[PDB]
C-alpha cells in the first residue's frame, strides 16, 4: 500500500512541472493561511489596544 | 525552419506539449499570486476572503 | 521466399521432459552432425554465504580433474580422444558444464557429464593444487579492469546481500576452503530439481531422455536432514565505490539502476532502449555518423575509448546501466551525455529510434542463438530462469509490441529520479560526486 | 543580356580590384569552413595568399594595378563543388533527422 | 622565470584583452569608435560624479544647484558642458558604431550584437533620465510626454506610469528616482561593456572586407593603441570645440527657464539623439502603435542577423546594398529633422513616408537586394 | 585564440622595414592626393545620391511649410 508521502511523490513531486504547481498553489494558500493565523495571534496578544478593536467606540 | 517541420519534430512537440502546458500553468499561477490579481483571485475560494 | 515470420515459425521447437528425480531434459534438434550437451545447475555465489563463498568456483575448478569412476587424466583423455570440448562457466546465479562433441558421441558425453556432476572425487591433493591456481587467478583478474569494475558495481549496488559476493570469492576463503565444505556445497546446491540437461544440434530427444534416465537417474533432490536452501530477495542500494588509482592509464566507470528480474515483461522494452543508447568502441568504423548520439559525440570528441550498455538480470533484481572507459579529463562529459540520453529516452523518445532499437534487438536475439553452444546455453538458462524456452516468435511478438510510449514509460519507471549505483576505477577524480550524478537522473525542464 | 549585367556587378564589386576571386569573399559559415578544410593544399594556399594580399591592400587603402585585376571569365569557383557537397551532406543529415 | 604580463592573472586578462589581442590589420577608422565609446563612458562617469558632488535632486534646489555648478563652482561650467556635450558625442559614436556593424556585417557576432542592443537601450534610458535632472522647462515637459507614452500599454498602463512617476504626475519623486537611476545605470553599462568585449574576443574583430583575417593579424598594443589614442584626440577636438566655442549648440534654450508645471514650453522636443524615434512615434496616430513602433525601431536591430540573406558578410563588395544602406542613413537624418519640426501638414506626410521607408529598407528591400546580388554573382 | 595557433598559412614571405629606417610620411601629398581622388570617385556615386534626395526634401518641406503659413488672399476676399 502506497503511503501518503509516496502518493504525493508519484502524483506531484516526480515531474518538476507538477512539483512547481504544488509549490505555487501551496504558496498562495500558505500566504492566506499564515497571514490570517499570525494576524490573529498578534491581535489576540494585543487585544483591546489595537485601533481596530477600539474604532467602534468613536466612529458613527 | 523547414528543418523542424517533420514527423519526428511533431512527435517531440506532442511529447513536450503537456510539460509546456504545466509550465504555463505554473507561470499563470505565479503571476496571479505575485501580483495578487484580484480578477482571477476573487474567484479562488478562501483566498477571496482577502480583499 | 521465406519471411522473418515464416522463418521464426519454422525454427525447431525445444522439447522439455522431466525425469522423476526432477532433472529436466530439453533438446533442440537440427541436421547438424555436431551437438552440445551440458548440465546447467541453479547454483552460484548468490546461493553462498560468507564462509563458503568461492566454493562453487573451487568445485568448477576441480570438476574436470577427476571422478571416482575415471581418474583425473582419464576424463580429459576420453573427452579429447573423441574430439569433444569440455567447458564450464560459473556465474553469480548459474553454473554450467557443457561438452561440444559429435552427435554420434552423445552417449559418452552424457556419461561423462553425469560422472562430473555426481561422482566428483574432490581429492584433497587436487584441492591444494587448485587452491594455488585459484589464488594465482585472483591475482590475475585484478588486471582485468572491466571485471573489477563490475564486481565493485555488484558490491556497492547489492551491498549486504549474497549477490554482492564475487563468484571467485575472497582469497581468505580460498585458502581456508576444505574438502568438507566443497562436498557440502555439492550436496546442498547440486540437486536434480535444480539441474537441467540441455542439448542442441543432432540430438534426438528420446535418445537424450533415455540416456539421462540411464545415467542421471540416481541424482536426488532430497536435502540431508531437511536442510533446504531458501532464496533471498536482494536489496539494491544506491551507492558509489571509487577506487582512485591515478597510475592506471584509463578510467573505468560503471553506473546502473535497479532493473527487472528475468521474468519481468519490462525486460524487452528496456533492451530496446539500451539498444537505442547503443555501444561504442574506438575501433568502431562508424564513428561520427553512428546513430547513437552518445556514440557520435564520443567519436567526434574522442570522449571515451569504449562505452557499452548492459542489462544484467537476476531472478528478482538486475543491474541496468552502462560501462565506459575514458580519459581522466573526459569522465564528466561522458557521464553528462549518458545521463542525458537516459533522460531523453525517458521523456522525449521517438518512434524512429524505437524502430531501430527493436530491429537491433531482433538481430541480436537471432544471431546469438546460432550454433549448438549458444542454443544449448539458451535452452538451459531459459529453463532455469524463465521456466521455459521463450520461442523466437514470442520474442518477436513482444518486441513488436514495443512503441515509443512503452519505451518512455519503462525508462521513466526504471531510470528517472532513481538513485544510481556507481563504481569507479583509475583516474576518476573528474567523476562527478554522487549528489551531481543523482541530480543528472532528473530534468528540471520535465 | 544577363551576362552583361552580371559583368557589370563583377566590376562594380571590388573583389576583382583587390585581386580576390568570388569564392574568396564568401562568408565563412560552418559549411564554408568545412569546404575550406576540404580544399586541396594548392588551392588553400592560393586562397590564403590572395586574402592576405587583399587585406594588406585594404590596410593601405590601395588597389591592385589594373592589369592585375581578376577577370570575370578567368575567375574560377574553386570552392563551389566542395561547398555544394558539404551542403548536400548537411541536407541529407537534416532529412534523416526530420523523420 | 616568466613574463609577468602573461603569468599574472589580472595582468594576463589585461594583456589578452588589450595588449596582445590578435587584431585584423585592415580595420579602418570606423573601428576606432568603440574605444571612443569607452572613453566617452569614462569621461561621462567622471564628469557626472564631479557634478553630483554639487547637485541636489530636490525640485526646490535642482535648477539652482546646476546654476551654482555653472557660476560659483570653480571650473564647474567646463564640467557641466563637458557632460552635456559628451552625451551627444556618446550618441554620435553609438550611431556610427551601429552603422559600421550594419554596413560591414558585424552583426554575425550574434551575442556581441545583442549585448550591444541591450547597451543601447541602457544608454538611451540614462540620457533620458539625465536630461530631467536639470529640471528645466524642457526637462519636465519632455519627461511628461515620454513617460506618458507608457500609459498606452494595455491594462497595466496607468499603474506602470504612476509607479514610475511616483505619483499622479512628474514631480519631486520622479526627479530623485531619475537621479538615482541615472547614477547607477552607467556602471551597469560599464559591466555590460566587459561582457561585450568577452563575446567579441571569442570571435575576434571583423574586417572591412568581411573575410576572415587569421592569416593577417597584427598585435593590438603597438598599432591599435596609437590609432585609438589619435581617435580619442580627434574626439576631444570635436567635443571641446562644442564645450568651449559653442557650449549651447546642441541644447534647446528653454531648458534655462525653471520648470513650470502650469505652462507648456513653446515646443516640446526630445534631445537630438531621440528625435529619430520621436518622429516614428508621432507618425503612427494610435498611441499603442506609436509606442510599439518606437520600441521596434531599436529592436529591429536584433532581427538584422536573421535578415542577412547575402553570401558575403560585408557590404564592401555589395554596391546595391551600399546604396540601400546610405538610403537608410539619409532616412534616419530625415526622421531627425521631422522630429525637430512641428506636427503639421508638410512634415506629417514626410515623417510617415520616412518611417515606412526605414522599416521597409531594413526588413524587405535589403534582403531581396542581397538575394539579387547573390544571383548576379552566379550564386 | 592566441597568436600561435590562429590559422594555417604556408609559403608566404613578408619583408618589413623598421620605422626608424623609413620615412613616416612617404609621398603623403604626391601619392595621397591621387589616391583620395580615386576613392572619392568610386564612393561618391553611391554615398551622395541618397543625401541629395534629403536636401531636396528639406528644401521642399521648408518651402511648403512657409507657404502654408502665408495668408491665402481668397479667404479674406469677399
Ligand atoms: C554614462 C553615460 C551618461 C550619459 C549618457 C549621461 C547623460 C546626461 C545628460 C544628457 C545630462 C543632462 C545634460 C544637461 O545638464 O543638460 C546629464 C546630467 C547629469 N548627469 Fe550624466 N550621463 C551619464 C553618466 C553619468 C554618471 C555616471 C553620473 C554620476 C553621478 C552622472 C551625473 C549627472 C548629473 C549629476 C547630472 C545633472 C547635473 C547637470 O545637469 O549638469 N551622469 N547626464
Ligand atoms: C557603451 C556602449 C558600447 C560600448 C562601450 C562598445 C564597445 C565596443 C568595442 C570597444 C568594440 C571593439 C570593436 C571596436 O572598437 O569597434 C565593440 C565591437 C562591437 N560592438 Fe560594441 N559597444 C557599445 C555598444 C554597442 C551597440 C549599441 C552595438 C549594436 C547595437 C554594438 C555591437 C558591436 C559589434 C557588432 C561589434 C563588432 C565590431 C567588429 O566587428 O570588430 N556595440 N564594441
TrEMBL record, chain A:
Annotated keywords: Electron transport, Membrane, Mitochondrion, Mitochondrion inner membrane, Respiratory chain, Transmembrane, Transmembrane helix, Transport
Chief localisation class: mitochondrion
InterPro entries linked: QCR9, QCR9_sf
This protein's GO CC annotations: mitochondrial inner membrane; respiratory chain complex III
Record's subcellular location: Mitochondrion inner membrane
Entries under Pfam families matching the protein: UCR_UQCRX_QCR9
Biological process according to GO: mitochondrial electron transport, ubiquinol to cytochrome c
Topology with respect to the bilayer: Single-pass membrane protein
Entry function: Component of the ubiquinol-cytochrome c oxidoreductase, a multisubunit transmembrane complex that is part of the mitochondrial electron transport chain which drives oxidative phosphorylation. The complex plays an important role in the uptake of multiple carbon sources present in different host niches.
Family: Belongs to the UQCR10/QCR9 family.
Name of the protein described by the UniProt record: Complex III subunit 9
Species name: Sus scrofa
Organism phylogeny: Eukaryota, Metazoa, Chordata, Craniata, Vertebrata
From TrEMBL, chain B:
Keyword Hydrolase among UniProt keywords: no
Transmembrane segments: 20-40
Keywords of the record: Electron transport, Membrane, Mitochondrion, Mitochondrion inner membrane, Respiratory chain, Transmembrane, Transmembrane helix, Transport
A Pfam match: UCR_6-4kD
Annotated GO CC locations: mitochondrial inner membrane; respiratory chain complex III
Top-level taxon of origin: Eukaryota
GO biological process: mitochondrial electron transport, ubiquinol to cytochrome c
Membrane topology of the entry: Single-pass membrane protein
Subcellular location: Mitochondrion inner membrane
InterPro entries tied to this protein: Single_a-helix_sf, UQCR
Main subcellular location of this protein, as a coarse class: mitochondrion
PANTHER family tied to this protein: CYTOCHROME B-C1 COMPLEX SUBUNIT 10, UBIQUINOL-CYTOCHROME C REDUCTASE COMPLEX 6.4 KD PROTEIN
Assembly and binders: Component of the ubiquinol-cytochrome c oxidoreductase (cytochrome b-c1 complex, complex III, CIII), a multisubunit enzyme composed of 11 subunits. The complex is composed of 3 respiratory subunits cytochrome b, cytochrome c1 and Rieske protein UQCRFS1, 2 core protein subunits UQCRC1/QCR1 and UQCRC2/QCR2, and 6 low-molecular weight protein subunits UQCRH/QCR6, UQCRB/QCR7, UQCRQ/QCR8, UQCR10/QCR9, UQCR11/QCR10 and subunit 9, the cleavage product of Rieske protein UQCRFS1.
Family statement: Belongs to the UQCR11/QCR10 family.
Descriptive protein name: Cytochrome b-c1 complex subunit 10
Organism annotation: Sus scrofa
Gene: UQCR11
UniProtKB/TrEMBL annotation, chain C:
Gene3D superfamilies: Metalloenzyme, LuxS/M16 peptidase-like (3.30.830.10)
Residue intervals of the Peptidase M16 C-terminal domain: 176-361
Record's GO cellular component terms: mitochondrial inner membrane; protein-containing complex
Keyword Mitochondrion: yes
GO molecular function: metal ion binding
Subcellular location: Mitochondrion inner membrane
KW Nucleotide-binding (keyword) present: no
First-listed, main subcellular location of the protein, grouped into a coarse class: mitochondrion
Family: Belongs to the peptidase M16 family. UQCRC1/QCR1 subfamily.
Protein name (Swiss-Prot/TrEMBL): Cytochrome b-c1 complex subunit 1, mitochondrial
Gene: UQCRC1
UniProtKB/TrEMBL annotation, chain E:
Record function comment: Component of the ubiquinol-cytochrome c reductase complex (complex III or cytochrome b-c1 complex) that is part of the mitochondrial respiratory chain. The b-c1 complex mediates electron transfer from ubiquinol to cytochrome c. Contributes to the generation of a proton gradient across the mitochondrial membrane that is then used for ATP synthesis.
Binding site for heme b b562: 83, 182
Cofactor note text: Binds 2 heme groups non-covalently.
Organism name: Sus scrofa
Boundaries of every Cytochrome b/b6 N-terminal region profile domain copy: 1-209
Protein name as catalogued: Cytochrome b
Positions contributing to a ubiquinone binding: 201
Keywords: Electron transport, Heme, Iron, Membrane, Metal-binding, Mitochondrion, Mitochondrion inner membrane, Respiratory chain, Transmembrane, Transmembrane helix, Transport, Ubiquinone
SUBUNIT field: The cytochrome bc1 complex contains 11 subunits: 3 respiratory subunits (MT-CYB, CYC1 and UQCRFS1), 2 core proteins (UQCRC1 and UQCRC2) and 6 low-molecular weight proteins (UQCRH/QCR6, UQCRB/QCR7, UQCRQ/QCR8, UQCR10/QCR9, UQCR11/QCR10 and a cleavage product of UQCRFS1). This cytochrome bc1 complex then forms a dimer.
Predominant subcellular localization, coarse grouping: mitochondrion
Cellular compartment(s): Mitochondrion inner membrane
Binding site for heme b 3: 44, 80, 83, 182
Name of the gene: cytb
Pfam hit, one: Cytochrome_B
Residues that hold heme b 1 according to the record: 31, 34-35, 97, 100, 106, 196, 205-206
Amino acid at each position: 500500500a502506497p503511503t501518503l508521502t509516496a502518493r504525493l511523490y508519484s502524483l506531484l513531486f516526480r515531474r518538476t512541472s507538477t512539483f512547481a504547481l504544488t509549490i505555487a498553489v501551496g504558496a498562495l494558500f500558505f500566504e492566506r493561511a499564515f497571514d490570517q493565523g499570525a494576524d490573529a495571534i498578534y491581535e489576540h496578544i494585543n487585544q483591546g489596544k489595537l485601533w481596530k478593536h477600539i474604532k467602534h467606540k468613536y466612529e458613527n | 525552419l523547414s528543418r523542424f517541420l517533420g514527423p519526428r519534430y511533431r512527435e517531440l512537440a506532442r511529447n513536450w506539449i503537456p510539460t509546456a502546458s504545466m509550465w504555463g500553468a505554473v507561470g499563470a499561477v505565479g503571476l496571479v499570486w505575485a501580483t495578487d490579481w484580484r480578477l482571477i483571485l476573487d474567484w479562488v475560494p478562501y483566498i477571496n476572503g482577502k480583499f | 521466399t521465406a519471411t522473418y515470420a515464416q522463418a521464426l515459425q519454422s525454427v525447431p521447437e525445444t522439447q522439455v521432459s522431466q525425469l522423476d528425480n526432477g532433472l529436466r531434459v530439453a533438446s533442440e534438434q537440427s541436421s547438424q552432425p555436431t551437438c552440445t550437451v551440458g548440465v546447467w545447475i541453479d547454483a552460484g555465489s548468490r546461493y553462498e554465504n560468507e564462509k563458503n563463498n568461492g566454493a562453487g568456483y573451487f568445485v568448477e575448478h576441480l570438476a574436470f580433474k577427476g571422478t571416482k569412476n575415471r581418474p583425473g587424466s582419464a576424463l580429459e583423455k576420453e573427452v579429447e580422444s573423441m574430439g569433444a570440448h569440455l567447458n564450464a562457466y560459473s556465474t553469480r546465479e548459474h553454473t554450467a558444464y557443457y561438452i561440444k562433441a559429435l552427435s554420434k558421441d552423445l552417449p559418452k558425453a552424457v556419461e561423462l557429464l553425469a560422472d562430473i556432476v555426481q561422482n566428483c572425487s574432490l581429492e584433497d591433493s587436487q584441492i591444494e593444487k587448485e587452491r594455488d591456481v585459484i589464488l594465482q587467478e585472483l591475482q590475475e583478474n585484478d588486471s582485468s579492469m572491466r571485471d573489477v569494475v563490475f564486481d565493485y558495481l555488484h558490491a556497492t549496488a547489492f551491498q549486504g546481500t549474497p549477490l554482492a559476493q564475487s563468484v571467485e570469492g575472497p582469497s581468505e576463503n580460498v585458502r581456508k576452503l576444505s574438502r568438507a565444505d566443497l562436498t557440502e556445497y555439492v550436496s546442498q546446491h547440486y540437486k536434480a530439481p535444480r539441474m537441467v540437461l540441455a542439448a542442441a544440434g543432432g540430438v534426438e530427444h528420446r535418445q537424450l531422455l533415455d540416456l539421462a534416465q540411464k545415467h542421471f537417474s540416481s541424482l536426488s533432490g532430497t536435502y540431508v536432514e531437511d536442510a533446504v536452501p531458501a532464496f533471498t530477495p536482494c536489496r539494491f542500494t544506491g551507492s558509489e565505490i571509487r577506487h582512485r588509482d591515478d597510475a592506471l592509464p584509463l578510467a573505468h566507470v560503471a553506473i546502473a539502476v535497479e532493473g527487472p528480474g528475468w521474468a519481468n515483461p519490462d525486460n524487452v522494452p528496456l533492451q530496446v532502449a539500451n539498444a537505442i543508447i547503443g555501444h561504442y568502441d574506438s575501433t568502431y568504423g562508424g564513428g561520427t555518423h553512428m546513430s547513437s548520439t552518445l556514440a557520435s559525440v564520443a567519436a567526434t570528441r574522442k570522449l571515451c575509448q569504449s562505452f557499452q550498455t548492459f542489462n544484467i538480470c537476476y531472478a528478482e533484481t538486475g543491474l541496468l546501466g552502462a560501462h565506459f572507459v575514458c580519459d581522466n579529463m573526459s569522465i564528466d562529459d561522458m557521464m553528462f551525455f549518458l545521463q542525458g540520453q537516459w533522460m531523453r529516452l525517458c521523456t522525449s523518445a521517438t518512434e524512429s529510434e524505437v524502430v531501430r532499437g527493436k530491429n537491433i534487438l531482433r538481430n541480436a536475439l537471432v544471431s546469438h542463438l546460432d550454433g549448438t553452444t549458444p542454443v544449448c546455453e539458451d535452452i538451459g538458462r531459459s529453463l532455469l530462469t524463465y521456466g521455459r524456452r521463450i520461442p523466437l516468435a514470442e520474442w518477436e511478438s513482444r518486441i513488436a509490441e514495443v512503441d515509443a510510449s512503452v519505451v518512455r514509460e519503462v525508462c521513466s519507471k526504471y531510470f528517472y529520479d532513481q538513485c544510481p549505483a556507481v563504481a569507479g576505477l583509475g583516474p576518476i577524480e573528474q567523476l562527478p560526486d554522487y549528489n551531481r550524478i543523482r541530480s543528472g537522473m532528473f530534468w528540471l525542464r520535465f | 543580356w544577363l551576362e552583361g549585367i552580371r559583368k557589370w556587378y563583377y566590376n562594380a564589386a571590388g573583389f576583382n580590384k583587390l585581386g580576390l576571386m568570388r569564392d574568396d569573399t564568401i562568408y565563412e559559415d560552418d559549411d564554408v569552413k568545412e569546404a575550406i578544410r576540404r580544399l586541396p593544399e594548392n588551392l588553400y594556399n592560393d586562397r590564403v595568399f590572395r586574402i592576405k594580399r587583399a587585406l594588406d591592400l585594404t590596410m593601405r587603402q590601395q588597389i591592385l594595378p589594373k592589369e592585375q585585376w581578376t577577370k570575370y571569365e578567368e575567375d574560377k569557383f574553386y570552392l563551389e563543388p566542395y561547398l555544394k557537397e558539404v551542403i548536400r551532406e548537411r541536407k541529407e543529415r537534416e532529412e534523416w533527422a526530420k523523420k | 622565470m616568466t613574463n609577468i604580463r602573461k603569468s599574472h592573472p589580472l595582468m594576463k586578462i589585461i594583456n589578452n584583452a588589450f595588449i596582445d589581442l590578435p587584431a585584423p590589420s585592415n580595420i579602418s577608422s570606423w573601428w576606432n569608435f568603440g574605444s571612443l565609446l569607452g572613453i566617452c563612458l569614462i569621461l561621462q562617469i567622471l564628469t557626472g560624479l564631479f557634478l553630483a558632488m554639487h547637485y541636489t535632486s530636490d525640485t526646490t534646489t535642482a535648477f539652482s544647484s546646476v546654476t551654482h555648478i555653472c557660476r560659483d563652482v570653480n571650473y564647474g561650467w567646463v564640467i557641466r558642458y563637458l557632460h552635456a556635450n559628451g552625451a551627444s558625442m556618446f550618441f554620435i559614436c553609438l550611431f556610427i558604431h551601429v552603422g559600421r556593424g550594419l554596413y560591414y556585417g558585424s552583426y554575425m557576432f550574434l551575442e556581441t550584437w545583442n549585448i550591444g542592443v541591450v547597451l543601447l537601450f541602457t544608454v538611451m534610458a540614462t540620457a533620458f533620465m539625465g536630461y530631467v535632472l536639470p529640471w528645466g522647462q524642457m526637462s519636465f515637459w519632455g519627461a511628461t510626454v515620454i513617460t506618458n507614452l507608457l500609459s498606452a500599454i494595455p491594462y497595466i498602463g496607468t499603474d506602470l506610469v504612476e509607479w514610475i512617476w511616483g505619483g499622479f504626475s512628474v514631480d519631486k519623486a520622479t526627479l530623485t528616482r531619475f537621479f538615482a537611476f541615472h547614477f547607477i545605470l552607467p556602471f551597469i553599462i560599464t559591466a555590460l561593456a566587459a561582457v561585450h568585449l568577452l563575446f567579441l574576443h571569442e570571435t575576434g574583430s571583423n574586417n572591412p572586407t568581411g573575410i576572415s583575417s587569421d592569416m593577417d593579424k597584427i598585435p593590438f598594443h603597438p598599432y591599435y593603441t596609437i590609432k585609438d589614442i589619435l581617435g580619442a584626440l580627434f574626439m576631444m577636438l570635436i567635443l571641446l570645440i562644442l564645450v568651449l566655442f559653442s557650449p549651447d549648440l546642441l541644447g534647446d534654450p528653454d531648458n534655462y527657464t525653471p520648470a513650470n508645471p502650469l505652462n507648456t514650453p513653446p515646443h516640446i522636443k526630445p534631445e537630438w539623439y531621440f528625435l529619430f524615434a520621436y518622429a516614428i512615434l508621432r507618425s503612427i496616430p494610435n498611441k499603442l502603435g506609436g509606442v510599439l513602433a518606437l520600441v521596434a525601431s531599436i529592436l529591429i536591430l536584433i532581427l538584422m542577423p536573421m535578415l542577412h540573406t547575402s553570401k558575403q558578410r560585408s557590404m564592401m563588395f555589395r554596391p546595391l546594398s551600399q546604396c540601400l544602406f546610405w538610403m537608410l542613413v539619409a532616412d534616419l537624418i530625415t526622421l531627425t529633422w521631422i522630429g525637430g519640426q512641428p506636427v503639421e501638414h508638410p512634415f506629417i506626410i514626410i515623417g510617415q513616408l520616412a518611417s515606412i521607408l526605414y522599416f521597409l529598407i531594413i526588413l524587405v528591400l535589403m534582403p531581396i537586394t542581397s538575394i539579387i546580388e547573390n544571383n548576379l554573382l552566379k550564386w | 585564440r592566441e597568436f600561435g595557433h590562429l590559422t594555417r598559412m604556408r609559403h608566404v614571405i613578408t619583408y618589413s622595414l623598421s620605422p626608424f629606417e623609413q620615412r613616416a610620411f612617404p609621398h603623403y601629398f604626391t601619392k595621397g592626393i591621387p589616391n583620395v581622388l580615386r576613392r572619392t570617385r568610386a564612393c561618391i556615386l553611391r554615398v551622395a545620391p541618397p543625401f541629395v534626395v534629403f536636401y531636396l526634401v528639406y528644401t521642399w518641406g521648408t518651402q511648403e511649410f512657409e507657404k502654408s503659413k502665408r495668408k491665402n488672399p481668397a479667404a479674406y476676399e469677399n
